[PDB]
Design a binder for this molecule. Structure first.
Ligand SMILES: CC(C)[C@H](Nc1ncnc2[nH]c(-c3ccc(=O)n(C)c3)cc12)c1ccc2c(c1)S(=O)(=O)CCC2
Length: 169
């Protein structure tokens, strides 16, 4: 079965959300596209990006270093398409702003705009966690910006509940 997402809550006609680890979702679903919460040099050192790279047994990092050698770094708000390895057909590496490191929150709209080049995606909540954006704001930007079908995996039941309550106000 293709893109067999289960147990998601439909928020809008094109945005779905689940309390789940994106790595476990990718292994089960093998979506056409999994989004990585990347940085501009594609160094997958921790958090979501480190977890996805480890699930590929470091194949993602070697491919990412060869992409950077030939093409140079991404811009904040930008993206590139590389292999999905064992997790998906493709990985869309998207750079959201890191507000904790002084980057502009307005670039979160540009970051989500990359999703619109793909019909269906499994994705994390961009710029949340240690990137420092307000996660309720990130969900609002996602809902207002993405027009293709996005399945958001948020690996924290406390945050999941706060996000759904906020959306349903
Ligand atoms: C808000 C968080 C609950 C959310 N975390 C996550 N959301 C979805 N799937 C996840 N898997 C793991 C994980 C982490 C270690 C690990 O060994 N495994 C297996 C799995 C984390 C995780 C999240 C959303 C976006 C971003 C971050 C964190 S960050 O990595 O702090 C900075 C980049 C932006």
């Amino acid at each position: 079965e293709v893109n067999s997402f289960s147990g998601y809550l439909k928020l809008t006609d094109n945005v779905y959300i689940k309390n789940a680890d994106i790595v476990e979702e990718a292994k089960k679903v093998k979506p056409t596209v999994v989004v990585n919460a990347a940085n501009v040099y594609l160094k997958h050192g921790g958090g979501v990006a480190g977890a996805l790279n480890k699930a590929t047994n470091n194949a993602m990092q070697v491919e990412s270093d060869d992409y950077i050698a030939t093409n140079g770094p991404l811009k904040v708000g930008g993206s590139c398409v590389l292999s999905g390895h064992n997790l998906a057909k493709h990985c869309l590496h998207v750079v959201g702003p890191n507000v904790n490191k002084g980057e502009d929150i307005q670039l979160l709209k540009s970051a989500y705009e990359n999703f619109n080049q793909h019909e269906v995606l499994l994705a994390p909540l961009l710029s949340a966690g240690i990137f420092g954006a307000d996660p309720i704001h990130s969900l609002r930007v996602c809902v207002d910006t993405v027009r293709t079908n996005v399945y958001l995996a948020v690996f924290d039941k406390n945050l999941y509940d706060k996000l759904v309550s906020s959306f349903l106000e």
